[PDB]
Design a protein around this ligand. Sequence first.
Ligand SMILES: O=C(c1cc2c(ccc[n+]2[O-])s1)N1CCN(S(=O)(=O)c2cc3cc(Cl)ccc3[nH]2)CC1
Ligand SMILES: [Ca+2]
Ligand SMILES: [Ca+2]
Lengths: 54, 233
Amino acid sequence: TRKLCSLDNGDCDQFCHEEQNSVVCSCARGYTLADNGKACIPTGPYPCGKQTLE
Amino acid sequence: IVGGQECKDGECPWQALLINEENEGFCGGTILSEFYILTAAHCLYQAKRFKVRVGDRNTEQEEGGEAVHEVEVVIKHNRFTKETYDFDIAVLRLKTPITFRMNVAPACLPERDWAESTLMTQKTGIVSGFGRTHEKGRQSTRLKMLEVPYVDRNSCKLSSSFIITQNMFCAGYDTKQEDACQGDSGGPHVTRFKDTYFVTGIVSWGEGCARKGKYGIYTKVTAFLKWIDRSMK
Ligand SMILES: O=C(c1cc2c(ccc[n+]2[O-])s1)N1CCN(S(=O)(=O)c2cc3cc(Cl)ccc3[nH]2)CC1
Ligand SMILES: [Ca+2]
Ligand SMILES: [Ca+2]
Protein backbone atom coordinates (compact mmCIF):
# COMPACT_ATOMS: atom_id res chain seq x y z
CA THR A 1 0.00 0.00 0.00
CA ARG A 2 1.32 3.40 -1.18
CA LYS A 3 2.82 5.62 1.50
CA LEU A 4 5.03 8.72 1.77
CA CYS A 5 6.82 9.56 -1.53
CA SER A 6 4.86 6.75 -3.17
CA LEU A 7 1.53 8.52 -2.47
CA ASP A 8 1.15 11.25 -5.08
CA ASN A 9 4.83 12.28 -4.68
CA GLY A 10 4.50 13.04 -0.97
CA ASP A 11 2.47 16.18 -1.91
CA CYS A 12 5.78 17.66 -3.05
CA ASP A 13 6.01 19.80 -6.22
CA GLN A 14 9.35 18.23 -7.32
CA PHE A 15 11.77 15.86 -5.48
CA CYS A 16 10.54 13.68 -2.70
CA HIS A 17 12.74 11.56 -0.38
CA GLU A 18 11.63 9.49 2.57
CA GLU A 19 13.87 10.45 5.54
CA GLN A 20 12.89 8.33 8.54
CA ASN A 21 9.29 7.41 7.94
CA SER A 22 8.25 10.85 6.61
CA VAL A 23 8.48 12.94 3.42
CA VAL A 24 11.18 15.47 2.77
CA CYS A 25 10.60 17.63 -0.33
CA SER A 26 13.16 19.63 -2.28
CA CYS A 27 13.53 21.55 -5.52
CA ALA A 28 15.63 21.77 -8.64
CA ARG A 29 18.28 24.51 -8.92
CA GLY A 30 16.71 27.92 -9.30
CA TYR A 31 13.79 27.09 -7.03
CA THR A 32 13.29 27.53 -3.34
CA LEU A 33 11.12 25.54 -1.08
CA ALA A 34 8.04 27.39 0.14
CA ASP A 35 7.19 27.74 3.89
CA ASN A 36 4.78 24.91 3.64
CA GLY A 37 7.81 22.76 2.84
CA LYS A 38 6.19 21.36 -0.31
CA ALA A 39 5.88 23.87 -3.17
CA CYS A 40 8.82 25.11 -5.19
CA ILE A 41 9.00 28.84 -5.96
CA PRO A 42 11.15 29.98 -8.91
CA THR A 43 13.72 32.48 -7.75
CA GLY A 44 13.99 34.25 -11.17
CA PRO A 45 12.58 34.57 -14.59
CA TYR A 46 13.51 31.68 -16.82
CA PRO A 47 13.68 29.05 -14.15
CA CYS A 48 14.56 25.61 -15.56
CA GLY A 49 11.86 23.39 -16.77
CA LYS A 50 9.29 26.01 -17.70
CA GLN A 51 8.00 26.79 -21.14
CA THR A 52 8.60 30.50 -21.79
CA LEU A 53 5.62 32.85 -21.40
CA GLU A 54 7.35 36.09 -22.40
CA ILE B 1 11.33 13.92 -36.12
CA VAL B 2 8.95 11.71 -38.10
CA GLY B 3 5.44 12.72 -37.31
CA GLY B 4 4.77 14.82 -34.20
CA GLN B 5 3.85 18.47 -34.16
CA GLU B 6 5.62 21.85 -34.44
CA CYS B 7 6.97 23.38 -31.27
CA LYS B 8 4.89 26.48 -30.92
CA ASP B 9 6.19 29.73 -29.52
CA GLY B 10 7.85 29.16 -26.17
CA GLU B 11 7.19 25.37 -26.02
CA CYS B 12 10.69 23.83 -26.54
CA PRO B 13 13.00 26.48 -25.12
CA TRP B 14 15.69 24.10 -23.79
CA GLN B 15 16.46 23.07 -27.42
CA ALA B 16 19.87 23.92 -28.94
CA LEU B 17 21.19 23.16 -32.45
CA LEU B 18 24.79 22.35 -33.27
CA ILE B 19 25.55 23.90 -36.65
CA ASN B 20 28.59 23.15 -38.90
CA GLU B 21 30.92 25.48 -40.92
CA GLU B 22 28.22 25.76 -43.58
CA ASN B 23 25.74 26.99 -40.88
CA GLU B 24 23.72 23.81 -41.31
CA GLY B 25 22.23 21.88 -38.32
CA PHE B 26 23.72 18.43 -37.80
CA CYS B 27 22.67 17.56 -34.22
CA GLY B 28 20.55 18.79 -31.26
CA GLY B 29 21.54 19.65 -27.71
CA THR B 30 19.78 20.51 -24.43
CA ILE B 31 20.38 23.79 -22.58
CA LEU B 32 21.49 22.98 -18.99
CA SER B 33 22.56 26.50 -17.77
CA GLU B 34 23.80 29.81 -19.15
CA PHE B 35 27.16 28.09 -20.06
CA TYR B 36 26.44 24.32 -20.56
CA ILE B 37 24.86 22.36 -23.29
CA LEU B 38 24.15 18.59 -23.01
CA THR B 39 24.68 16.55 -26.23
CA ALA B 40 25.58 13.06 -27.57
CA ALA B 41 29.27 12.13 -27.93
CA HIS B 42 28.63 10.68 -31.40
CA CYS B 43 27.72 14.16 -32.70
CA LEU B 44 31.22 15.32 -32.00
CA TYR B 45 32.55 13.44 -35.06
CA GLN B 46 29.97 14.75 -37.54
CA ALA B 47 31.87 17.99 -38.09
CA LYS B 48 35.30 19.68 -37.55
CA ARG B 49 34.42 22.99 -35.95
CA PHE B 50 30.84 23.70 -34.91
CA LYS B 51 28.91 26.35 -33.00
CA VAL B 52 25.62 26.23 -31.06
CA ARG B 53 22.46 28.07 -32.01
CA VAL B 54 19.69 28.73 -29.45
CA GLY B 55 16.30 30.37 -29.76
CA ASP B 56 15.67 29.17 -33.33
CA ARG B 57 12.35 27.59 -34.43
CA ASN B 58 12.51 28.05 -38.21
CA THR B 59 15.93 27.77 -39.73
CA GLU B 60 14.75 29.42 -42.94
CA GLN B 61 13.97 32.74 -41.27
CA GLU B 62 15.55 34.99 -38.61
CA GLU B 63 12.72 35.79 -36.16
CA GLY B 64 15.31 37.95 -34.31
CA GLY B 65 15.53 35.69 -31.26
CA GLU B 66 18.37 33.45 -32.38
CA ALA B 67 21.93 33.57 -31.03
CA VAL B 68 25.06 31.63 -31.95
CA HIS B 69 27.68 30.75 -29.36
CA GLU B 70 31.14 29.42 -29.77
CA VAL B 71 32.25 26.32 -27.95
CA GLU B 72 35.09 26.76 -25.49
CA VAL B 73 35.48 23.28 -23.89
CA VAL B 74 34.15 19.90 -25.12
CA ILE B 75 33.96 17.19 -22.38
CA LYS B 76 33.24 13.89 -24.17
CA HIS B 77 32.64 10.79 -22.00
CA ASN B 78 35.93 8.84 -21.85
CA ARG B 79 34.15 5.50 -22.40
CA PHE B 80 32.18 6.54 -25.48
CA THR B 81 32.24 3.62 -27.91
CA LYS B 82 31.40 4.41 -31.51
CA GLU B 83 30.71 0.80 -32.34
CA THR B 84 27.81 0.38 -29.95
CA TYR B 85 26.97 4.03 -29.09
CA ASP B 86 27.45 3.22 -25.35
CA PHE B 87 28.23 6.27 -23.07
CA ASP B 88 26.83 8.54 -25.81
CA ILE B 89 26.99 11.82 -23.90
CA ALA B 90 29.04 15.00 -23.91
CA VAL B 91 28.88 18.48 -22.28
CA LEU B 92 29.85 21.73 -24.05
CA ARG B 93 30.94 24.79 -22.15
CA LEU B 94 30.16 27.93 -24.05
CA LYS B 95 32.55 30.86 -24.56
CA THR B 96 29.84 33.40 -23.79
CA PRO B 97 26.81 32.80 -21.56
CA ILE B 98 23.34 32.23 -22.97
CA THR B 99 20.80 34.98 -22.47
CA PHE B 100 17.53 33.40 -21.43
CA ARG B 101 14.43 34.85 -23.05
CA MET B 102 11.43 33.64 -25.03
CA ASN B 103 12.27 30.23 -26.58
CA VAL B 104 15.53 30.10 -24.65
CA ALA B 105 15.64 28.58 -21.18
CA PRO B 106 17.19 25.58 -19.55
CA ALA B 107 15.59 22.20 -18.77
CA CYS B 108 15.99 20.98 -15.15
CA LEU B 109 18.31 18.16 -14.11
CA PRO B 110 16.61 15.77 -11.76
CA GLU B 111 17.84 13.97 -8.70
CA ARG B 112 18.77 10.42 -9.62
CA ASP B 113 16.61 8.13 -7.49
CA TRP B 114 13.53 10.36 -7.68
CA ALA B 115 13.93 10.54 -11.49
CA GLU B 116 14.15 6.79 -11.85
CA SER B 117 11.17 6.02 -9.67
CA THR B 118 9.06 9.05 -10.57
CA LEU B 119 10.01 10.46 -14.01
CA MET B 120 10.87 7.33 -15.91
CA THR B 121 7.77 5.55 -14.79
CA GLN B 122 5.47 8.17 -16.34
CA LYS B 123 3.76 7.11 -19.52
CA THR B 124 5.59 9.46 -21.88
CA GLY B 125 8.38 12.04 -22.45
CA ILE B 126 8.98 14.57 -25.16
CA VAL B 127 11.69 14.50 -27.68
CA SER B 128 12.33 17.44 -30.01
CA GLY B 129 14.49 18.36 -33.03
CA PHE B 130 15.24 19.63 -36.56
CA GLY B 131 16.27 16.30 -38.01
CA ARG B 132 14.77 14.30 -40.86
CA THR B 133 11.01 13.97 -41.37
CA HIS B 134 11.36 10.45 -42.58
CA GLU B 135 14.15 7.93 -43.03
CA LYS B 136 14.89 8.88 -46.64
CA GLY B 137 13.87 12.52 -46.19
CA ARG B 138 15.25 15.98 -45.65
CA GLN B 139 15.83 17.82 -42.40
CA SER B 140 12.98 19.82 -41.04
CA THR B 141 13.27 23.61 -41.20
CA ARG B 142 10.84 23.92 -38.31
CA LEU B 143 11.54 22.67 -34.79
CA LYS B 144 9.28 19.71 -34.08
CA MET B 145 8.26 17.76 -30.98
CA LEU B 146 6.90 14.28 -30.39
CA GLU B 147 5.43 12.62 -27.32
CA VAL B 148 7.03 9.11 -27.02
CA PRO B 149 5.96 6.39 -24.68
CA TYR B 150 8.58 4.82 -22.41
CA VAL B 151 9.16 1.18 -23.44
CA ASP B 152 9.81 -1.85 -21.14
CA ARG B 153 13.51 -2.80 -21.00
CA ASN B 154 12.59 -6.40 -21.82
CA SER B 155 10.46 -5.67 -24.92
CA CYS B 156 13.14 -3.36 -26.19
CA LYS B 157 15.92 -5.83 -25.88
CA LEU B 158 13.74 -8.32 -27.71
CA SER B 159 13.23 -5.87 -30.54
CA SER B 160 16.79 -4.71 -31.12
CA SER B 161 19.62 -6.19 -33.24
CA PHE B 162 22.16 -4.20 -31.28
CA ILE B 163 22.88 -4.51 -27.61
CA ILE B 164 20.93 -2.15 -25.30
CA THR B 165 23.24 -1.45 -22.35
CA GLN B 166 22.26 -0.13 -18.90
CA ASN B 167 23.27 3.33 -20.16
CA MET B 168 20.34 3.35 -22.62
CA PHE B 169 16.57 3.15 -22.47
CA CYS B 170 14.05 2.80 -25.30
CA ALA B 171 11.09 5.06 -26.15
CA GLY B 172 8.75 5.26 -29.07
CA TYR B 173 6.20 3.09 -30.95
CA ASP B 174 6.18 -0.47 -32.34
CA THR B 175 4.10 0.22 -35.45
CA LYS B 176 2.99 3.84 -35.29
CA GLN B 177 5.05 5.90 -37.76
CA GLU B 178 6.57 8.35 -35.26
CA ASP B 179 10.10 8.63 -34.10
CA ALA B 180 13.17 10.79 -33.94
CA CYS B 181 15.47 10.44 -36.91
CA GLN B 182 18.81 11.72 -38.25
CA GLY B 183 19.76 15.25 -37.19
CA ASP B 184 17.72 14.91 -33.96
CA SER B 185 20.58 13.15 -32.22
CA GLY B 186 22.04 14.83 -29.14
CA GLY B 187 18.70 16.60 -28.65
CA PRO B 188 16.56 16.55 -25.53
CA HIS B 189 14.27 13.90 -24.20
CA VAL B 190 12.42 15.50 -21.29
CA THR B 191 9.65 14.28 -18.98
CA ARG B 192 7.00 16.67 -17.59
CA PHE B 193 6.12 16.48 -13.94
CA LYS B 194 3.41 18.82 -12.77
CA ASP B 195 4.34 21.83 -14.66
CA THR B 196 8.11 21.45 -14.97
CA TYR B 197 10.20 19.65 -17.60
CA PHE B 198 13.23 17.58 -16.53
CA VAL B 199 15.88 16.18 -18.79
CA THR B 200 15.67 12.37 -18.92
CA GLY B 201 17.48 11.38 -22.02
CA ILE B 202 19.57 12.28 -25.04
CA VAL B 203 18.55 11.23 -28.57
CA SER B 204 21.14 8.61 -29.50
CA TRP B 205 20.15 6.04 -32.18
CA GLY B 206 17.65 3.79 -33.91
CA GLU B 207 17.71 1.21 -36.70
CA GLY B 208 16.44 3.62 -39.40
CA CYS B 209 13.61 5.87 -38.15
CA ALA B 210 10.02 4.89 -37.33
CA ARG B 211 10.38 1.27 -38.49
CA LYS B 212 7.73 -1.17 -37.36
CA GLY B 213 8.92 -3.22 -34.39
CA LYS B 214 11.85 -0.87 -33.67
CA TYR B 215 12.05 1.86 -31.06
CA GLY B 216 14.25 4.91 -30.38
CA ILE B 217 17.19 4.44 -28.04
CA TYR B 218 18.13 7.35 -25.73
CA THR B 219 21.13 7.74 -23.41
CA LYS B 220 19.84 7.29 -19.87
CA VAL B 221 20.68 10.65 -18.38
CA THR B 222 20.12 9.42 -14.81
CA ALA B 223 23.17 7.08 -15.06
CA PHE B 224 25.31 10.19 -15.71
CA LEU B 225 24.12 12.81 -13.24
CA LYS B 226 27.24 12.65 -11.10
CA TRP B 227 29.34 12.83 -14.22
CA ILE B 228 27.39 15.84 -15.50
CA ASP B 229 27.73 17.60 -12.14
CA ARG B 230 31.48 16.99 -12.29
CA SER B 231 31.84 18.34 -15.81
CA MET B 232 30.03 21.55 -15.05
CA LYS B 233 32.62 21.83 -12.24
O1 LIG C 1 20.71 1.84 -38.14
C1 LIG C 1 21.57 2.60 -37.68
C2 LIG C 1 22.38 2.10 -36.67
C3 LIG C 1 23.76 1.80 -36.59
C4 LIG C 1 24.15 1.32 -35.30
C5 LIG C 1 23.06 1.25 -34.38
C6 LIG C 1 23.33 0.77 -33.07
C7 LIG C 1 24.60 0.41 -32.67
C8 LIG C 1 25.59 0.49 -33.61
N1 LIG C 1 25.37 0.89 -34.84
O2 LIG C 1 26.41 0.91 -35.62
S1 LIG C 1 21.66 1.78 -35.15
N2 LIG C 1 21.60 3.89 -38.13
C9 LIG C 1 20.50 4.27 -39.02
C10 LIG C 1 19.57 5.32 -38.38
N3 LIG C 1 20.40 6.43 -37.89
S2 LIG C 1 19.70 7.99 -37.70
O3 LIG C 1 18.69 8.10 -38.75
O4 LIG C 1 20.79 8.92 -37.55
C11 LIG C 1 18.83 7.94 -36.26
C12 LIG C 1 19.15 8.44 -35.01
C13 LIG C 1 17.99 8.10 -34.21
C14 LIG C 1 17.66 8.31 -32.89
C15 LIG C 1 16.47 7.81 -32.40
CL1 LIG C 1 16.02 8.06 -30.74
C16 LIG C 1 15.58 7.13 -33.23
C17 LIG C 1 15.89 6.93 -34.59
C18 LIG C 1 17.07 7.39 -35.07
N4 LIG C 1 17.65 7.33 -36.33
C19 LIG C 1 21.28 5.96 -36.83
C20 LIG C 1 22.28 4.97 -37.42
CA1 LIG D 1 15.01 31.26 -37.41
CA1 LIG E 1 8.74 1.78 -34.35
